[PDB]
Design an enzyme around this catalytic site. Structure first.
Site, PDB file in Angstrom:
ATOM      1  N   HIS B 235       2.879  32.861  32.716  1.00 53.02           N
ATOM      2  CA  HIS B 235       1.422  32.000  32.739  1.00 53.02           C
ATOM      3  C   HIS B 235       1.526  30.601  32.847  1.00 53.02           C
ATOM      4  O   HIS B 235       1.081  30.209  33.521  1.00 53.02           O
ATOM      5  CB  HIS B 235       0.475  32.131  31.238  1.00 53.02           C
ATOM      6  CG  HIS B 235       0.216  33.790  31.192  1.00 53.02           C
ATOM      7  ND1 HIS B 235      -0.414  34.385  32.316  1.00 53.02           N
ATOM      8  CD2 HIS B 235      -0.081  34.606  30.022  1.00 53.02           C
ATOM      9  CE1 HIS B 235      -0.741  35.808  31.747  1.00 53.02           C
ATOM     10  NE2 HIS B 235      -0.554  35.663  30.416  1.00 53.02           N
ATOM     11  N   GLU B 239       0.804  28.483  36.476  1.00 51.29           N
ATOM     12  CA  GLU B 239      -0.359  27.394  36.378  1.00 51.29           C
ATOM     13  C   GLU B 239       0.505  25.972  37.278  1.00 51.29           C
ATOM     14  O   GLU B 239      -0.160  25.335  37.889  1.00 51.29           O
ATOM     15  CB  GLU B 239      -0.769  27.039  35.170  1.00 51.29           C
ATOM     16  CG  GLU B 239      -1.605  28.166  34.459  1.00 51.29           C
ATOM     17  CD  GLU B 239      -2.815  28.546  35.376  1.00 51.29           C
ATOM     18  OE1 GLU B 239      -3.250  29.721  35.755  1.00 51.29           O
ATOM     19  OE2 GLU B 239      -3.732  27.521  35.808  1.00 51.29           O
ATOM     20  N   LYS B 242       0.789  26.533  40.882  1.00 50.98           N
ATOM     21  CA  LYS B 242      -0.693  26.185  41.535  1.00 50.98           C
ATOM     22  C   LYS B 242      -0.904  24.880  41.652  1.00 50.98           C
ATOM     23  O   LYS B 242      -1.145  24.411  42.891  1.00 50.98           O
ATOM     24  CB  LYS B 242      -1.778  27.122  40.746  1.00 50.98           C
ATOM     25  CG  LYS B 242      -1.701  28.441  41.035  1.00 50.98           C
ATOM     26  CD  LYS B 242      -2.787  29.231  39.902  1.00 50.98           C
ATOM     27  CE  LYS B 242      -4.281  28.469  40.099  1.00 50.98           C
ATOM     28  NZ  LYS B 242      -4.281  27.302  39.153  1.00 50.98           N
ATOM     29  N   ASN B 243      -0.771  24.253  40.620  1.00 53.85           N
ATOM     30  CA  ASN B 243      -0.856  22.438  40.691  1.00 53.85           C
ATOM     31  C   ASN B 243      -0.128  21.827  41.533  1.00 53.85           C
ATOM     32  O   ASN B 243      -0.421  21.050  42.311  1.00 53.85           O
ATOM     33  CB  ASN B 243      -0.746  21.853  39.007  1.00 53.85           C
ATOM     34  CG  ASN B 243      -1.900  22.330  38.072  1.00 53.85           C
ATOM     35  OD1 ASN B 243      -2.767  22.929  38.560  1.00 53.85           O
ATOM     36  ND2 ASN B 243      -1.726  22.162  36.986  1.00 53.85           N
TER      37      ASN B 243
END
Ligand code: EH0
Ligand code: EH0
Lengths: 365, 362
Positions: B235, B239, B242-243
């Site tokens: 998780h 994230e 992705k950023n």
């Protein structure tokens, strides 16, 4: 025991400390420092400002020393720093009624400030000596250490702000009426070449490292000028401030690098990146020194563990609205970052906020 | 007739019991283990549920009356009630233990939607009552607690359901519930990257490549393993990938070559550290705090709660997740984890008069 403290009361210090501590410091902007060192500014304006402002700055932090726990305040070294502050306050009090129109007043003032500047050279290691006296006579109880940390951050920021005001006066008004185009406005370089200061800080760090270890890692520097790619990075700043920060960070990086490569023929170089964005000027110092666990970062920033280089380097960064952060990777190395304002308009003195009430107001819906 | 408040008031007078990673590992598949877990979770879940339920009912009325918050609150009542059925039942009865496990799976399924629903409620509040900056530091405070609470509750339920499921050839027979005792960190990094690259490739036709360096300080040549919950690590890494990819692609809109995302994995005596470095052009220091804010983060490849919640996962087993940027250049994100499973203890919201007064003051 208490001879310096006796000698101070007999001098009328408390009267003056109580008086001047009733007022708030006036924070100055970088612009105000630049203009108050432009020709249009006067030695008389500076004299009448500093003969009120210095005593207010001195009185406020003197009030705050006298609020430390008695176990620290009664240490010889703290009593000594306090005596230097009394002497310096008294020194300036001589000037309260003197005439600004008299050229000999202005000259004597400037000499008094230089005397004060010189008196306070050893303040940092002396206050540190007092903290060691307390540590090595009483406990290492974690409540009293967050108290001393709180006071020392304020004291040392206060001190930076006072030497800045004195440096601007002495450097600008150093005796005679001087020629047209000074390279600096006092201690402020309006075209400060960041990489030149990095190399200076490295040069002195490498000298010391070479004296005590006989090896020292090399320096690699990369610049990133985001707006103007590959133009050398300049800013308005106090080079001595930038140098103090970079010096301490270089010493630590070199210590870690050398101590973690006892058996290595190659030392990994220290990498420094300088990046200029729209808002921030950022300086990353990266070492392969084997790093610190996350739990012990807090300690590096603590006066209770001189050792004072990192905490005080942060204070210099915070003084003109910057910061200094440290990120380690245990087993690998450490990244230290100085954050500065890219714009001189965003740079105001950050001073300890004094004379807050001990009474906290309560808050509802 | 059904007395949620009675039970909420009762169970909220007790403190959650934090468990160590070791304590999670030690639970064997035994009937004797299933009984210990049953008698522990039929007290502990309701205490965890009651505490965060008490705290929802202290939020400002502007938020509490939002449809989506009322909905999450109703799902917590249902789930608390579900477990209350089991309070007087006999652990020695094999049918009790079986029904419990089914109730927990129902609860697990009920709460799948909770994160985006609570976010929907925060949007409902923002877009009906605006952004007075007092109520935003209140919602930030509450959301960090709620989402950490939620992670701790799904962990407890995951361990019970996965261990005492009772199917013959399982998926991950290596695992103790959701815990991999020989978790290969780099394998999880590659997984997180693969899914991030897929999404990046869907919405832009380009995606940066991945470079990984490992530093096993003590044992130089050896691949880096640890005791951890792979889904937690995934998780966080998802994230952050992705950023980093969003920033990299948006700062090279016209480039065919993208700078790679560099990931270093270091294992020291105390810390396991994962640095993700991108040349995405970076964020000014003043706006870092915003990236960690539920109020700002609709992602103006974007979700918004990713970074705050990724940090909560990191903090849950005594880690951290910090981000340091260099405006004009790029960003470094670092996951700090405990190298040792003995140092890894649940960090749960502290529930008490001081934590509950934040909803009255400043
Ligand atoms: O003490 C002060 O307040 C400042 C005085 C300062 O003295 C220090 C020093 F120059 C360097 C280190 C150090 C170490 C280390 O390799 N060893 C220290 C240790 C301690 C415990 C453990 C462990 O428990 O594993 C491991 C390493 N690794 O990175 C750094 C490091 C620290 C800073 Cl602030 C920096 O700007 C750059 C660095 O590379 C630690 C210092 F402290
Ligand atoms: O999903 C989440 O967790 C949060 C999702 C919120 O969405 C963001 C996002 F994905 C990435 C960035 C971003 C930028 C950038 O610069 N983006 C564009 C912009 C440029 C300039 C300015 C400015 O000058 O203010 C502001 C934004 N640079 O580095 C990052 C970055 C941020 C994080 Cl949290 C990370 O783990 C890795 C990164 O590279 C900013 C976001 F906001």
């Amino acid at each position: 025991d208490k001879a310096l403290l006796k000698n101070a009361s007999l001098a009328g210090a408390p009267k003056y400390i109580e008086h001047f501590s009733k007022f708030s410091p006036s924070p100055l902007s970088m612009k105000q420092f630049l203009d108050f060192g432009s020709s249009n500014a006067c030695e008389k304006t500076s004299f009448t400002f500093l003969r009120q402002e210095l005593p207010v700055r001195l009185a406020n932090i003197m009030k705050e020393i006298n609020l430390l726990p008695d176990r620290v305040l009664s240490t010889p070294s703290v009593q000594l720093v306090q005596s230097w502050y009394v002497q310096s306050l008294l020194d300036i009090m001589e000037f309260l009624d003197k005439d600004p129109e008299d050229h000999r007043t202005l000259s004597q003032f400037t000499d008094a400030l230089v005397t004060i500047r010189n008196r306070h050279n050893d303040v940092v290691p002396t206050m540190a000596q007092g903290v060691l006296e307390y540590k090595d006579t009483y406990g290492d109880d974690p409540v009293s250490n967050q108290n001393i940390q709180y006071f020392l951050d304020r004291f040392y920021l206060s001190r930076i702000s006072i030497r800045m005001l004195i440096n601007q006066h002495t450097l600008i008004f150093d005796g005679s009426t001087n020629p047209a185009h000074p390279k600096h406005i006092g201690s402020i370089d309006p075209n400060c070449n960041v990489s030149e200061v990095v190399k200076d800080a490295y040069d002195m760090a490498k000298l010391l490292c070479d004296k005590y270890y006989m090896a020292s890692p090399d320096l690699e520097i990369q610049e990133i000028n985001a707006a103007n790619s590959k133009q050398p990075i300049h800013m308005v700043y106090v080079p001595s401030h930038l140098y103090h920060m970079l010096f301490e960070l270089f010493k630590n990086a070199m210590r870690a690098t050398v101590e973690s490569h006892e058996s290595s023929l190659i030392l990994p170089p220290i990498k420094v990146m300088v990046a200029l964005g729209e808002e921030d000027l950022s300086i990353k110092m990266s070492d392969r020194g084997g790093g610190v666990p996350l739990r012990k970062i807090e300690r590096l920033f603590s006066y209770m563990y001189f050792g004072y280089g990192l905490p005080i380097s942060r204070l210099y960064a915070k003084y003109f609205q910057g910061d200094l952060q440290l990120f380690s990777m245990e087993g690998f190395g450490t990244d230290a970052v100085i954050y500065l304002k890219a714009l001189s308009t965003d740079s105001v003195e950050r001073l300890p906020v004094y004379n807050k009430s001990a009474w906290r107001h309560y808050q509802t819906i």
